[PDB]
């Protein structure tokens, strides 16, 4: 009957009401376990249909027809570890302890990437926020649904407290490298003024 | 009837129109009490029915 | 109970912010100013119902005299700065530079 | 319920987040000055509420 | 199986796997013996020839 390929639907965030299109395959296929033309309903890539449970109920409301969700929209983290420059992330699914991995140039910079940034994208697969704040952790909460409709696959939350504490790096790298710096200038006697700007 | 989990409902503040949503629990008990699906309707913690 | 670092500035608290979030679960309010009440009144349900727990108010002019701290303090850190500067002779500007 | 013995809560350490329990007296005695449930807690042992 | 392409293949599969070794590593001195050549580098802090 339908050959559509997009679905309108739309959800509330921050007190705004915004709208994004689900894709379908458009004529093939019946899918039985969810009852829903999917493209290759098991692959994360882009393009591939993504039903979240939260829109799933709605959707079988808007069409008069019981619909299976396919997966939950966020989990929650629990533990990570650094290691040779990457970073695991623990939570569970479906009662199993499972973690994914990420790289760590991501989280130079968290206020990009905290709950609603200006640009209004994620860049990765995460977010950020407070754990004492009840309405930083409600707008993470509305907001994760949103983002994970935008792209494929769910979204993981990260507490502020738990992940702070594990960017540490070393300003005794910068007293070793100062101490480098004097010992330069003492073997050559350089100025100390361009050393300074060029420290900054 | 309903598996819903967020209901809708809208307020006035400074003249202009919001929205936000209410929790329920989604198909399991009744809570008699204020006859709602609740979910541990007892605690101040997030995501809790208020 | 709840901790006093989040009075140090009430302007980020009162009202409707720009941010359009409370840190906290109280409010602050003239209690002269009609509108002023008027408004937090109207406002309480949505922060409330943004995030669970009631929400407190807070007159402005009640905690307006409980926020003290002391002027003494800052005498007593120029007496000390004095007493520093009388036992090594620093020079004024940098004393003042970190003064301010 | 919550008048039970035990009470479970959870708090962040390094990157672990770790789980511990809180006693009670179960229901017998009520504590006006601090206003819980607790046991003998002017003393530290085994099984007592801190 | 390497990095670059590890995270490709979660993706695809839906869950995590584990890259078994790095895709390349940088040669520091070279020796020449009886018409052949040897290449030297290290490999996670140990040294390494071919």
Same mark, same amino acid.
């Given at each position: 009957?339908?050959?559509?390929?997009?679905?309108?639907?739309?959800?509330?965030?921050?007190?705004?009401?915004?709208?994004?299109?689900?894709?379908?395959? =458009?004529? /093939?296929?019946?899918?039985?376990?969810?009852?829903?033309?999917? *493209? @290759?309903? %098991?692959?994360?890539? #882009?393009?591939? &249909?993504?039903?979240?449970?939260?829109?799933?109920?709605?959707?079988?409301?808007?069409?008069?027809?019981?619909?299976?969700?396919?997966?939950?929209?966020?989990?929650?983290?629990?533990?990570?570890?650094?290691?040779?420059?990457?970073?695991?992330?623990?939570?569970?699914?479906? =009662?199993? /302890?499972?973690?994914?991995?990420?790289?760590?140039?991501?989280? *130079? @910079?968290? %206020?990009?990437?905290? #709950?609603?940034? &200006?640009?209004?994208?994620?860049?990765?697969?995460?977010?950020?926020?407070?754990?004492?704040?009840?309405?930083?952790?409600?707008?993470?909460?509305?907001?994760?649904?949103?983002?994970?409709?935008?792209?494929?696959?769910?979204?993981?939350?990260?507490?502020?407290?738990?992940?702070?504490?594990?960017?540490?790096?070393?300003?005794?790298?910068?007293?070793?490298?100062?101490?480098?710096?004097?010992?330069?200038?003492? &073997?050559?006697?350089?100025?100390?003024?361009?050393?300074?700007?060029?420290?900054?």
């Amino acid at each position: 009957r339908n050959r559509a390929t997009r679905v309108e639907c739309t959800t509330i965030v921050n007190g705004v009401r915004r709208s994004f299109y689900v894709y379908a395959n =458009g004529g /093939k296929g019946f899918c039985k376990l969810h009852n829903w033309n999917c *493209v @290759n309903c %098991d692959t994360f890539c #882009a393009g591939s &249909t993504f039903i979240s449970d939260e829109v799933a109920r709605d959707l079988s409301l808007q069409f008069k027809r019981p619909i299976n969700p396919t997966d939950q929209s966020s989990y929650i983290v629990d533990s990570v570890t650094v290691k040779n420059g990457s970073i695991h992330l623990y939570f569970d699914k479906a =009662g199993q /302890k499972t973690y994914e991995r990420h790289s760590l140039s991501h989280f *130079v @910079n968290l %206020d990009n990437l905290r #709950a609603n940034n &200006t640009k209004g994208s994620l860049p990765i697969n995460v977010i950020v926020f407070d754990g004492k704040s009840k309405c930083e952790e409600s707008s993470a909460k509305s907001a994760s649904v949103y983002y994970s409709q935008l792209m494929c696959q769910p979204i993981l939350l990260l507490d502020q407290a738990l992940v702070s504490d594990v960017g540490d790096s070393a300003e005794v790298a910068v007293k070793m490298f100062d101490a480098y710096v004097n010992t330069f200038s003492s &073997t050559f006697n350089v100025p100390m003024e361009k050393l300074k700007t060029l420290v900054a």
